[PDB]
Amino acid sequence: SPAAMERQVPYTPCSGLYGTAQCCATDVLGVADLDCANPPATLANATHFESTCAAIGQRARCCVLPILGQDILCQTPAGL
């Protein structure tokens, strides 16, 4: 019984252009990046991540690091 799977590897957050997993706010129309910061919780899975942002009254959206010269990009994984 080789123990090679028993030791799971570090979870891999939002894989994509944004590569990061956080919790931000949105405006009335839905387009905005109000109050953006790292999400404090124990991430276990997709739904678990959604519960992380809902915990403080926010939604799950993976934002990409700001780049002087372009607009801010952010979207939800699998429409979570």
Contact 66, 11 (CB under 8 A): no
Please provide residue 59's backbone torsions phi and psi, each rounded to the nearest 5 degrees: -115, 165
Contact 43, 21 (CB under 8 A): yes
β strands within the chain, DSSP E = 22-25, 34-37, 59-63, 74-75
User: Under CATH, which architecture does the 1-80 domain have?
Assistant: Alpha-Beta Barrel (3.20)
Question: Which amino acid belongs to residue 30?
Answer: G
In the chain, where are the structural domains located?
1-80
Experimental determination approach used: NMR
